[PDB]
Amino acid sequence: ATYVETDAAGPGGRAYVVDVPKVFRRNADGDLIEITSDAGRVNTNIVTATEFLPDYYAVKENAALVVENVTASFPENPSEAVIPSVLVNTLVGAPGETSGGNRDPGHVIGLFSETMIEAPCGTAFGSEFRVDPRREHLDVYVAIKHVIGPDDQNGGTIGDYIIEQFDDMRGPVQNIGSLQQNYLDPRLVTTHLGGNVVNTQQLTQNITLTKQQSGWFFMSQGTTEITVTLGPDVTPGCHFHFIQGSAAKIKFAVSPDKAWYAKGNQTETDGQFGECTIRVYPFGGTVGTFKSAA
Amino acid sequence: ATYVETDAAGPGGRAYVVDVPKVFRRNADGDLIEITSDAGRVNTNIVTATEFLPDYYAVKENAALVVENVTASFPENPSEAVIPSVLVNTLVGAPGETSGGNRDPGHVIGLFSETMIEAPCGTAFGSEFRVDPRREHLDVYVAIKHVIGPDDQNGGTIGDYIIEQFDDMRGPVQNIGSLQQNYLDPRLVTTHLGGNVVNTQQLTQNITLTKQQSGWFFMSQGTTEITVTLGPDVTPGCHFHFIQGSAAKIKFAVSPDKAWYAKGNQTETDGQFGECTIRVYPFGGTVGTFKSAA
Amino acid sequence: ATYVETDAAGPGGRAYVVDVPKVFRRNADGDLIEITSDAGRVNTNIVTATEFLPDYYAVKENAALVVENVTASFPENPSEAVIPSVLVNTLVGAPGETSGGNRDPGHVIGLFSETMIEAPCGTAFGSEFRVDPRREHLDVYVAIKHVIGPDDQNGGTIGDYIIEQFDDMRGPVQNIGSLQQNYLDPRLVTTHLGGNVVNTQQLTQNITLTKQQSGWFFMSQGTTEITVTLGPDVTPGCHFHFIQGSAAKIKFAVSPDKAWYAKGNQTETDGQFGECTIRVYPFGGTVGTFKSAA
């Protein structure tokens, strides 16, 4: 780190020529930040309790970190450049280097959002996506977009890909009152071009159907009769399928608020290999479509 | 000053360190210009975008906040820790105290994303999840991965959990053209294990089927003749189901751009409980499977 | 350069000042790179990860950016105010001005996540949402929402509002091992009121069924018989729908691992307008519900 006379600063310029690729790390209130082109790292904030002010300025003044990006092109030349607001670039391994990596026990996270709740709270939001078309027309908006780079530039191989992955914690977690997934606006259309898989189970004891049992396949296996009771929590719209693979018969019952509706008033399957489709319609309309054993 | 083996510049080290959080540089005029930077909790950027350039180095030149996190390890000792590029924590209630909380009117949000529109905009992205396997092999990729704390370490309870909620805004918004959820790659293998609910409708008058009503279960009610007309918008591949629960007949009509197809050119139902399943197919092939009344 | 005491770094502050307008760094190749400050926060970090420590305090040490929000409120008067943690406000055009814009080739991204791979890796997460109810009870939690400003506040229009978009990259991308979307907790209940669209195709030669083809509709065209073989990859819980669209019969074959199962061991459709519903059940039970040609 000296002042030298070099041509890189001009025909006869002078410069400070610190001679290490990892130039000044700088010391913040405890940590070496990075090259002297960065800012503070750890941010904390405490908000003051107030009333409901559903305004953008109000939530801005309550926010802990505010990032805003404004683009202003000319009317003659509306630009076509990609303008992200927040760019999080997770990188593993230095470019041009074949050193190290991360193993299975650990994992790298592009963005970790953790909810820390220990006080009585009404609702908590993990994310939110709002669009405000104040003045103009937007041709198309997408909340979540998935892009994978073409193989002509990326020679790597991805063994497995998951769009969305949800584990099971029936043992470790019991305090969840109810977990669901709601789409209250039927305007959307699901253009699912792939396959699908549904749950299946074999019945041997009498069961009470709820909203979770919507749509699986039931196998009546055993010798004693198996009774299925449609609980009051079952909502119109779901459907269940039953097929008998054994000699045991299948009995059906409904909640008092549901009135049985069937062709011929049949309350059980006719025989083995007989199909039974149970469908629920508004104001408690239970319809059981039966198929002959033969 | 001085050069140190900090180990914060990789496994090797050998970086240059300055022991104060602010450094400066004297320009030609004689006044100091800061080399470093430190912004508060509010950040603002204005960009005069040039022509389209899909280069990551060019892309980061327009972002208002760029975050990188590089993981480096020895080739013989790959890392096994967890490396989140960005960590955001939403804490309610000071630890060691249960005082206070948030009711229904106020909702704590881990991450807020929103947009204002004031100029003609082509398209807008609420998020984007890219991946570039530039050189090496990656085993598993996950876009969104939901985690619930185990109850052995969590004495509290969660009454309701929603992995995704989309409300209905029939009244408040009417400027939206279409609502879509596209999966343009049939190579996707969706795996489900929960339940499903299908919207159900009771038909009583003339109806022109569109994209929104696809996949539903329709009920024939009343005595007057009910006609279902398939408009041009109905793309191939959609499926519809109809059940005649009364004596009202059901007629089927197709747009002139496609030809109706059924069993024996039967363009109507046969009677009560005569179910018709309509499946559209390319080249204008609209097939209808008709079920006998008895 | 020497540390000095100046007011330019705050009232009664100290700094590290270089007395030359140009400061240079020697990179790994010996070239000189000028050190300069751009616009926007460039928060960056490099981590030499230790062993696996799955603790919040431990993991927070490896984050390039940490945001902490504590909404402590009084016990007798809990708050009812919306309090986000990270607020992102991307907008186009200043309020009150219609000048300029951004056409379709360009776009704005609310949060541009990224992931570059240069070294072998085990697991990568695009994002992660976690809830930790240590002490108290939470009423409702929703991971991700979708809120659109009501028209009484927004005067513009939206063309398309895509909840989730996934394009097709068969050409550019062929190094992907597989594409999946797994839900391995059966307790989940979904309420999809919108339309559902699946993939349909017409057979022309002998084919082998895969997981991607589950839940599709097929028709046989021509005169030569077409053989459909269930591949070894087929697992229990799938379903396939087949209809003979022409005079050519469709023969059914099963891999040695799976066992064929049908009413009367009917391995092919009798004639045109026949129906088959092939469902795979535990222990390799490939059971096919059959409907005759008529």
GROMACS .gro file of N, CA and C in nm, chain C residues 157-247:
model
  273
  745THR      N    1  -5.609  -0.083  -1.571
  745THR     CA    2  -5.655  -0.217  -1.603
  745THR      C    3  -5.538  -0.314  -1.604
  746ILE      N    4  -5.570  -0.442  -1.582
  746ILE     CA    5  -5.472  -0.550  -1.584
  746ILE      C    6  -5.514  -0.649  -1.692
  747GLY      N    7  -5.420  -0.684  -1.779
  747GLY     CA    8  -5.447  -0.783  -1.882
  747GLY      C    9  -5.461  -0.923  -1.826
  748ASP      N   10  -5.352  -0.977  -1.772
  748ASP     CA   11  -5.350  -1.111  -1.717
  748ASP      C   12  -5.289  -1.108  -1.577
  749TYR      N   13  -5.354  -1.177  -1.484
  749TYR     CA   14  -5.305  -1.190  -1.347
  749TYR      C   15  -5.274  -1.338  -1.324
  750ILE      N   16  -5.148  -1.375  -1.343
  750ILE     CA   17  -5.105  -1.514  -1.336
  750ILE      C   18  -5.059  -1.543  -1.193
  751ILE      N   19  -5.126  -1.639  -1.129
  751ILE     CA   20  -5.085  -1.680  -0.995
  751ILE      C   21  -4.949  -1.748  -0.999
  752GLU      N   22  -4.931  -1.840  -1.093
  752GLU     CA   23  -4.804  -1.910  -1.111
  752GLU      C   24  -4.786  -1.941  -1.258
  753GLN      N   25  -4.665  -1.915  -1.309
  753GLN     CA   26  -4.634  -1.936  -1.450
  753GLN      C   27  -4.513  -2.027  -1.461
  754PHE      N   28  -4.523  -2.128  -1.548
  754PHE     CA   29  -4.412  -2.218  -1.576
  754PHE      C   30  -4.413  -2.249  -1.725
  755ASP      N   31  -4.312  -2.202  -1.796
  755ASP     CA   32  -4.305  -2.218  -1.941
  755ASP      C   33  -4.252  -2.358  -1.974
  756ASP      N   34  -4.228  -2.382  -2.103
  756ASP     CA   35  -4.172  -2.508  -2.150
  756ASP      C   36  -4.036  -2.481  -2.212
  757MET      N   37  -3.937  -2.561  -2.175
  757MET     CA   38  -3.800  -2.547  -2.222
  757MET      C   39  -3.745  -2.682  -2.267
  758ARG      N   40  -3.825  -2.753  -2.348
  758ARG     CA   41  -3.782  -2.882  -2.399
  758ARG      C   42  -3.657  -2.869  -2.485
  759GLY      N   43  -3.653  -2.767  -2.571
  759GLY     CA   44  -3.539  -2.745  -2.657
  759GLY      C   45  -3.416  -2.699  -2.582
  760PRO      N   46  -3.421  -2.579  -2.525
  760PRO     CA   47  -3.301  -2.525  -2.457
  760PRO      C   48  -3.253  -2.609  -2.339
  761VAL      N   49  -3.344  -2.674  -2.266
  761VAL     CA   50  -3.308  -2.746  -2.144
  761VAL      C   51  -3.336  -2.894  -2.166
  762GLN      N   52  -3.233  -2.977  -2.147
  762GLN     CA   53  -3.249  -3.122  -2.151
  762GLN      C   54  -3.166  -3.193  -2.045
  763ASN      N   55  -3.097  -3.119  -1.958
  763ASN     CA   56  -3.011  -3.178  -1.856
  763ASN      C   57  -3.082  -3.194  -1.722
  764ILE      N   58  -3.211  -3.166  -1.716
  764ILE     CA   59  -3.288  -3.176  -1.592
  764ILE      C   60  -3.324  -3.322  -1.569
  765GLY      N   61  -3.295  -3.371  -1.448
  765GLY     CA   62  -3.325  -3.510  -1.417
  765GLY      C   63  -3.474  -3.539  -1.418
  766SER      N   64  -3.552  -3.453  -1.353
  766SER     CA   65  -3.696  -3.471  -1.343
  766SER      C   66  -3.758  -3.342  -1.291
  767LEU      N   67  -3.890  -3.332  -1.305
  767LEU     CA   68  -3.967  -3.220  -1.253
  767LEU      C   69  -4.079  -3.276  -1.167
  768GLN      N   70  -4.086  -3.231  -1.042
  768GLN     CA   71  -4.178  -3.288  -0.945
  768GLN      C   72  -4.246  -3.178  -0.866
  769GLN      N   73  -4.354  -3.216  -0.798
  769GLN     CA   74  -4.421  -3.127  -0.702
  769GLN      C   75  -4.486  -3.218  -0.599
  770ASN      N   76  -4.420  -3.235  -0.485
  770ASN     CA   77  -4.454  -3.338  -0.388
  770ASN      C   78  -4.530  -3.278  -0.270
  771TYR      N   79  -4.632  -3.349  -0.225
  771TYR     CA   80  -4.705  -3.320  -0.102
  771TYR      C   81  -4.717  -3.450  -0.024
  772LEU      N   82  -4.627  -3.473   0.070
  772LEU     CA   83  -4.625  -3.600   0.140
  772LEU      C   84  -4.692  -3.595   0.277
  773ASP      N   85  -4.763  -3.487   0.309
  773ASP     CA   86  -4.852  -3.486   0.423
  773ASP      C   87  -4.995  -3.500   0.373
  774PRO      N   88  -5.066  -3.608   0.406
  774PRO     CA   89  -5.205  -3.622   0.358
  774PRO      C   90  -5.305  -3.535   0.432
  775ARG      N   91  -5.266  -3.471   0.543
  775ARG     CA   92  -5.361  -3.390   0.619
  775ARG      C   93  -5.407  -3.266   0.544
  776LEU      N   94  -5.339  -3.229   0.436
  776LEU     CA   95  -5.372  -3.109   0.362
  776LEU      C   96  -5.505  -3.126   0.290
  777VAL      N   97  -5.585  -3.019   0.289
  777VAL     CA   98  -5.710  -3.015   0.214
  777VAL      C   99  -5.707  -2.893   0.123
  778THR      N  100  -5.737  -2.915  -0.005
  778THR     CA  101  -5.732  -2.811  -0.106
  778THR      C  102  -5.873  -2.780  -0.156
  779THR      N  103  -5.899  -2.653  -0.183
  779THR     CA  104  -6.029  -2.607  -0.232
  779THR      C  105  -6.004  -2.525  -0.359
  780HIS      N  106  -5.999  -2.594  -0.473
  780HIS     CA  107  -5.975  -2.531  -0.602
  780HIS      C  108  -6.109  -2.515  -0.673
  781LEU      N  109  -6.168  -2.396  -0.661
  781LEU     CA  110  -6.296  -2.368  -0.723
  781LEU      C  111  -6.285  -2.339  -0.872
  782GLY      N  112  -6.165  -2.314  -0.923
  782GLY     CA  113  -6.147  -2.279  -1.063
  782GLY      C  114  -6.148  -2.400  -1.154
  783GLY      N  115  -6.136  -2.372  -1.284
  783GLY     CA  116  -6.137  -2.477  -1.384
  783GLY      C  117  -6.005  -2.553  -1.387
  784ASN      N  118  -6.015  -2.683  -1.417
  784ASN     CA  119  -5.900  -2.771  -1.427
  784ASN      C  120  -5.891  -2.825  -1.569
  785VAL      N  121  -5.772  -2.816  -1.628
  785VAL     CA  122  -5.748  -2.862  -1.764
  785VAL      C  123  -5.633  -2.962  -1.762
  786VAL      N  124  -5.649  -3.073  -1.834
  786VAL     CA  125  -5.548  -3.177  -1.838
  786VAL      C  126  -5.501  -3.196  -1.982
  787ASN      N  127  -5.408  -3.289  -2.003
  787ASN     CA  128  -5.350  -3.314  -2.134
  787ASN      C  129  -5.421  -3.431  -2.201
  788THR      N  130  -5.452  -3.414  -2.329
  788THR     CA  131  -5.517  -3.517  -2.409
  788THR      C  132  -5.436  -3.540  -2.536
  789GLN      N  133  -5.439  -3.664  -2.585
  789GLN     CA  134  -5.365  -3.700  -2.705
  789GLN      C  135  -5.431  -3.822  -2.768
  790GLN      N  136  -5.395  -3.847  -2.894
  790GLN     CA  137  -5.447  -3.960  -2.970
  790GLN      C  138  -5.332  -4.053  -3.005
  791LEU      N  139  -5.349  -4.182  -2.974
  791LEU     CA  140  -5.243  -4.278  -2.998
  791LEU      C  141  -5.227  -4.307  -3.147
  792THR      N  142  -5.103  -4.330  -3.188
  792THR     CA  143  -5.072  -4.371  -3.325
  792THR      C  144  -4.985  -4.495  -3.333
  793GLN      N  145  -4.903  -4.524  -3.232
  793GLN     CA  146  -4.820  -4.644  -3.228
  793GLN      C  147  -4.819  -4.698  -3.086
  794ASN      N  148  -4.752  -4.811  -3.067
  794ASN     CA  149  -4.739  -4.869  -2.934
  794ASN      C  150  -4.658  -4.777  -2.844
  795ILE      N  151  -4.706  -4.754  -2.722
  795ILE     CA  152  -4.645  -4.660  -2.630
  795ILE      C  153  -4.627  -4.726  -2.493
  796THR      N  154  -4.545  -4.663  -2.410
  796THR     CA  155  -4.521  -4.705  -2.273
  796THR      C  156  -4.564  -4.593  -2.179
  797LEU      N  157  -4.647  -4.627  -2.081
  797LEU     CA  158  -4.700  -4.529  -1.987
  797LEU      C  159  -4.594  -4.490  -1.885
  798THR      N  160  -4.591  -4.362  -1.850
  798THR     CA  161  -4.502  -4.309  -1.748
  798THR      C  162  -4.582  -4.230  -1.646
  799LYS      N  163  -4.512  -4.177  -1.545
  799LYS     CA  164  -4.578  -4.096  -1.444
  799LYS      C  165  -4.631  -3.965  -1.502
  800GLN      N  166  -4.563  -3.910  -1.602
  800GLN     CA  167  -4.607  -3.786  -1.664
  800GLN      C  168  -4.740  -3.801  -1.736
  801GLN      N  169  -4.774  -3.922  -1.780
  801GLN     CA  170  -4.894  -3.945  -1.859
  801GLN      C  171  -5.016  -3.978  -1.774
  802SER      N  172  -5.002  -3.983  -1.641
  802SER     CA  173  -5.113  -4.020  -1.555
  802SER      C  174  -5.223  -3.915  -1.561
  803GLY      N  175  -5.348  -3.962  -1.557
  803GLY     CA  176  -5.461  -3.872  -1.560
  803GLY      C  177  -5.488  -3.806  -1.693
  804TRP      N  178  -5.445  -3.868  -1.803
  804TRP     CA  179  -5.467  -3.815  -1.936
  804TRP      C  180  -5.582  -3.889  -2.004
  805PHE      N  181  -5.618  -3.841  -2.123
  805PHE     CA  182  -5.721  -3.903  -2.205
  805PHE      C  183  -5.659  -3.941  -2.339
  806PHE      N  184  -5.687  -4.062  -2.385
  806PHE     CA  185  -5.627  -4.115  -2.507
  806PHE      C  186  -5.734  -4.172  -2.599
  807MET      N  187  -5.713  -4.158  -2.729
  807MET     CA  188  -5.799  -4.216  -2.831
  807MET      C  189  -5.714  -4.289  -2.933
  808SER      N  190  -5.763  -4.403  -2.980
  808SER     CA  191  -5.696  -4.481  -3.083
  808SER      C  192  -5.752  -4.444  -3.219
  809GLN      N  193  -5.662  -4.411  -3.312
  809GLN     CA  194  -5.700  -4.371  -3.447
  809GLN      C  195  -5.631  -4.462  -3.548
  810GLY      N  196  -5.706  -4.503  -3.649
  810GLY     CA  197  -5.655  -4.589  -3.753
  810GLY      C  198  -5.716  -4.729  -3.748
  811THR      N  199  -5.642  -4.823  -3.805
  811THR     CA  200  -5.685  -4.963  -3.811
  811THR      C  201  -5.589  -5.059  -3.744
  812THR      N  202  -5.458  -5.034  -3.750
  812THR     CA  203  -5.362  -5.122  -3.685
  812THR      C  204  -5.376  -5.113  -3.534
  813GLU      N  205  -5.371  -5.229  -3.468
  813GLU     CA  206  -5.384  -5.232  -3.323
  813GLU      C  207  -5.266  -5.162  -3.257
  814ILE      N  208  -5.294  -5.096  -3.145
  814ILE     CA  209  -5.195  -5.018  -3.071
  814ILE      C  210  -5.177  -5.082  -2.934
  815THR      N  211  -5.053  -5.108  -2.897
  815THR     CA  212  -5.021  -5.170  -2.769
  815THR      C  213  -4.972  -5.064  -2.671
  816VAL      N  214  -5.034  -5.059  -2.554
  816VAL     CA  215  -4.995  -4.969  -2.447
  816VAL      C  216  -4.941  -5.054  -2.333
  817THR      N  217  -4.816  -5.031  -2.295
  817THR     CA  218  -4.749  -5.109  -2.192
  817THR      C  219  -4.722  -5.021  -2.071
  818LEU      N  220  -4.766  -5.065  -1.954
  818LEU     CA  221  -4.739  -4.993  -1.830
  818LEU      C  222  -4.595  -5.020  -1.789
  819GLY      N  223  -4.513  -4.915  -1.789
  819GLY     CA  224  -4.373  -4.928  -1.757
  819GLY      C  225  -4.349  -4.962  -1.612
  820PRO      N  226  -4.229  -5.010  -1.580
  820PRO     CA  227  -4.198  -5.042  -1.440
  820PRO      C  228  -4.203  -4.920  -1.349
  821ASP      N  229  -4.189  -4.800  -1.405
  821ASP     CA  230  -4.192  -4.678  -1.325
  821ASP      C  231  -4.329  -4.648  -1.266
  822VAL      N  232  -4.435  -4.715  -1.314
  822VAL     CA  233  -4.569  -4.688  -1.265
  822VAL      C  234  -4.582  -4.734  -1.120
  823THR      N  235  -4.637  -4.647  -1.036
  823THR     CA  236  -4.652  -4.670  -0.893
  823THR      C  237  -4.799  -4.673  -0.856
  824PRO      N  238  -4.834  -4.734  -0.742
  824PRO     CA  239  -4.974  -4.732  -0.698
  824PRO      C  240  -5.023  -4.591  -0.672
  825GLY      N  241  -5.152  -4.570  -0.695
  825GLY     CA  242  -5.215  -4.441  -0.675
  825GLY      C  243  -5.239  -4.360  -0.801
  826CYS      N  244  -5.210  -4.415  -0.918
  826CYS     CA  245  -5.230  -4.346  -1.044
  826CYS      C  246  -5.361  -4.390  -1.109
  827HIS      N  247  -5.399  -4.319  -1.215
  827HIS     CA  248  -5.520  -4.351  -1.289
  827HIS      C  249  -5.504  -4.305  -1.434
  828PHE      N  250  -5.557  -4.385  -1.526
  828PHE     CA  251  -5.552  -4.356  -1.668
  828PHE      C  252  -5.689  -4.383  -1.730
  829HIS      N  253  -5.729  -4.297  -1.822
  829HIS     CA  254  -5.857  -4.308  -1.891
  829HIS      C  255  -5.832  -4.333  -2.040
  830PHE      N  256  -5.894  -4.439  -2.093
  830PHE     CA  257  -5.874  -4.481  -2.231
  830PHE      C  258  -6.009  -4.498  -2.299
  831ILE      N  259  -6.018  -4.452  -2.423
  831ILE     CA  260  -6.136  -4.472  -2.507
  831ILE      C  261  -6.089  -4.506  -2.648
  832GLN      N  262  -6.149  -4.610  -2.706
  832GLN     CA  263  -6.114  -4.652  -2.842
  832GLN      C  264  -6.188  -4.564  -2.942
  833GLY      N  265  -6.114  -4.475  -3.008
  833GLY     CA  266  -6.176  -4.380  -3.099
  833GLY      C  267  -6.197  -4.431  -3.240
  834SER      N  268  -6.138  -4.545  -3.275
  834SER     CA  269  -6.150  -4.600  -3.410
  834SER      C  270  -6.174  -4.750  -3.399
  835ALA      N  271  -6.167  -4.818  -3.513
  835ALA     CA  272  -6.185  -4.963  -3.514
  835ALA      C  273  -6.063  -5.037  -3.460
   0.00000   0.00000   0.00000
